[PDB]
């Protein structure tokens, strides 16, 4: 049996999101890609460097917004710009988000030497695709 990236069946009480519900073989069929860069296109360079930068950017956002992330972040690279689009729960006060946005953007622009912008969409609570 395949155990990879599958949220296994419980007894109908586990709320999985749209991303979590779909197994790997639905990638490019029902669900898209969380990161979009040009480094895995044919005859393109720096795949190793883009992939490592993404791994860090995902761990950084989790720690900087602990318990405030409703779903996995979406990374969009255009030219040298990096764009982080995260669904965030409405737990923290509004002004705290303005601090964490200013901090996380400035810190990540001086670490990778690129313009980094943070786009936050606030949800009242995690969106449940199905109960499994």
């Amino acid at each position: 049996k395949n155990r990879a990236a599958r949220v296994r069946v419980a007894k109908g009480n586990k709320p999985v999101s749209y991303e979590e519900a779909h197994a790997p073989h639905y990638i490019a069929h029902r669900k898209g890609w969380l990161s979009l860069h040009t480094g895995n296109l044919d005859g393109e360079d720096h795949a190793a460097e883009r992939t490592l930068e993404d791994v860090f950017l995902r761990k950084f956002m989790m720690g900087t917004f602990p318990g405030c992330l409703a779903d996995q972040i979406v990374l969009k690279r255009r030219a040298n710009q990096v764009d982080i689009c995260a669904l965030v729960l409405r737990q923290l006060p509004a002004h705290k988000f303005y601090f964490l946005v200013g901090y996380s953007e400035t810190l990540l622009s001086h670490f990778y030497k690129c313009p980094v912008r943070l786009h936050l969409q606030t949800v009242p609570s995690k969106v449940v695709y199905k109960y499994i």
Binding site: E49, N80, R90, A94, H95, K96, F97, Y98, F99, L100, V101, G102, Y103, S104, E105, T106, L107, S109, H110, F111, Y112, K113, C114, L120, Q121, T122
Partner: protein
């Protein structure tokens, strides 16, 4: 190509309903938490630079590299002193300069002047910074100036400017006398500080004082020094003290500005307006007409930052428009703001909200409701989040246009801007709606608005045990319920007059009785009598007699009604 989005907050604010600033406080607080996070990040980068040194950006980006502000030249040489001066460290540079003198090593006059510039400009105090000032007679700047073996025009000039900046007007003027005795020549910047000194000093006689400032100008031509914009701007700013006597002098300066070839900037007009349109002007009967001429002169021109008072102009011009109650002039002023990129000179946070608040208030007062509502959608929320008084002006305008059907909607807009629990606004909304009668459909709509404004009072009362329901809202909310098919709710609200011990008004009491007659419910009619007895209102007895004739009272009701009549 693109224009401002009327339904969006400023781009600085994050585009999310949870993160959009409701009020003006959250606007400033959100832009102070953002700056706080930016400063927190720069602290980490500038304190642990080894982690932010790998450069992977081609081309190389200088502004995304760690900054270093501490001197890295250890040897004590004139070169090392120059580094400290470049880094702007004041105390460290003084220590190394004195050490250089202790050894006696030669120091260039140009290098010694760069030290005085730093000390004179910062007034012997370390540059202001954040991390986890009068001129002092005994200071490093004056001491170093004396130790200097060879002096040049720049050295004296630097002292004169630093003194004036740090409020040392009397000493600076004395230093200037030495410069003349040495036969050196000053620069435009030094002449501007000297003029700023004479004005700030209080001279007993204005005629002497003005003749003195003119003497500085006469020495500017003897020394073949040509004035700049700041020179004239400084003179006009000084003239704002003498509003009455500075009018003819002020105009003469502007004519000389054009003849010389200096182009008046927005700051130059900002000073003439203050001098001709005093805020504390008792003589409002016949104001000056100069504001009309200036706007024609500046019509269609584009302006750039060329002084430190350019931002002030627009806020001042709008104020003069509101004082004169001329809405045509306000359009010319706003139209000038829209030409080119003049929008950048509206002002900062304190003055940006005054300009538009003054502007929008003038629109509602003197503009047609149809046009007034177009401006309302454009300016708010995209330009500015208004304070509650702005809405009281809007609701008053709606009342004057006989379009009270829109009052319910204005309430919903007001709630977004943090006026949900505003007592003054809630009293105005209900007051206008219930001031006069309306068709059934309009009354039903107002009744829904009255229910919403009641929920604010109820929820507020739940939080606060020591809560007071103001008397007037109680009357307005009850009347609206009766008039709009919510009479059942109005009977429950009749009891709240006793719970909060508010005296029911005579009009309200009789209104309840009229509705009772149409309903035909004697029980409800007697309920009004009960409340009248509680407050010992004289009309209560007359109302009880009115019920006797309006409805047939059962023998049980007669006994109950008689008891209340006795009470």
């Amino acid at each position: 190509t693109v224009n401002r989005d009327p339904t969006a907050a400023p781009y600085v604010f994050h585009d999310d309903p949870y993160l959009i600033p409701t009020s003006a406080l959250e606007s400033r607080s959100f832009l102070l938490a953002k700056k706080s996070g930016e400063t927190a990040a720069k602290f980490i980068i500038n304190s642990y630079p080894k982690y932010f040194q790998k450069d992977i950006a081609e081309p190389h980006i200088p502004c995304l590299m760690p900054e270093y502000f501490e001197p890295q030249i250890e040897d004590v040489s004139e070169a090392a002193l120059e580094e400290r001066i470049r880094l702007r460290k004041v105390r460290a540079s003084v220590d190394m300069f004195d050490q250089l003198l202790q050894a006696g090593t030669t120091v260039s006059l140009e290098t010694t002047n760069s030290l005085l510039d730093l000390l004179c400009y910062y007034g012997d105090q370390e540059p202001p910074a954040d991390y986890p000032g009068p001129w002092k007679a005994q200071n490093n700047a004056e001491r170093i100036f004396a130790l200097m073996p060879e002096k040049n025009a720049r050295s004296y000039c630097t002292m004169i400017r630093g003194m004036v900046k740090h409020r040392a007007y009397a000493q600076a003027l004395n230093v200037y006398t030495e410069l003349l005795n040495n036969r050196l020549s000053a620069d435009v910047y030094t002449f501007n500080a000297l003029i700023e000194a004479k004005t700030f000093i209080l001279n007993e006689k204005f005629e002497e004082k003005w003749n003195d400032i003119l003497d500085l100008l006469k020495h500017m031509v003897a020394q073949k020094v040509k004035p700049n914009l700041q020179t004239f701007n400084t003179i006009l700013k000084g003239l704002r003290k003498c509003y009455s006597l500075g009018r003819i002098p002020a105009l003469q300066i502007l004519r000389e500005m054009k003849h010389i070839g200096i182009e008046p900037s927005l700051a130059t007009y900002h000073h003439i307006i203050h001098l001709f349109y005093p805020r504390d002007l008792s003589a409002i009967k016949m104001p000056s007409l100069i504001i009309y001429d200036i706007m024609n002169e500046l019509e269609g021109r584009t302006f750039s930052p060329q002084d430190l008072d350019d931002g002030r102009f627009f806020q001042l011009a709008m104020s003069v428009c509101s004082s004169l109650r001329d809405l045509e002039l306000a359009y010319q002023v706003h139209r000038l703001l829209n030409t080119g990129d003049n929008r950048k000179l509206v002002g900062h946070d304190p003055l940006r909200k005054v300009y538009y608040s003054k502007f929008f208030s003038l629109i509602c007062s003197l503009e047609q409701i149809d046009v007034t509502l177009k401006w309302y959608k454009d300016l708010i929320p995209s330009v500015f989040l208004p304070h509650y008084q702005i809405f009281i002006g809007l609701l008053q305008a709606l009342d004057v246009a006989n379009r009270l059907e829109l009052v319910p909607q204005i309430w919903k807009d007001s709630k977004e801007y943090s006026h949900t629990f505003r007592d003054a606004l809630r009293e105005e909304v209900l007051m206008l709606m219930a001031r006069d009668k309306h068709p059934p459909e309009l009354q039903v709509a107002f009744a829904d608005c009255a229910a919403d404004i009641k929920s604010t009072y109820e929820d507020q009362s739940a939080r606060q045990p020591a809560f007071d329901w103001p008397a007037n809202p109680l009357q307005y909310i009850a009347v609206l319920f009766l008039r709009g098919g919510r009479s059942q709710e109005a009977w429950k609200m009749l009891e709240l007059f006793k719970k909060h011990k508010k005296i029911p008004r005579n009009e309200l009491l009789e209104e309840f009785m009229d509705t009772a007659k149409a309903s035909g419910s004697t029980a409800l009619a007697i309920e009004v009598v009960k409340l009248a007895s509680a407050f010992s209102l004289p009309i209560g007895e007359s109302l009880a007699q009115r019920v006797v004739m309006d409805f047939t009272v059962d023998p049980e009701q007669k006994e109950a009604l008689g008891n209340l009549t006795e009470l």
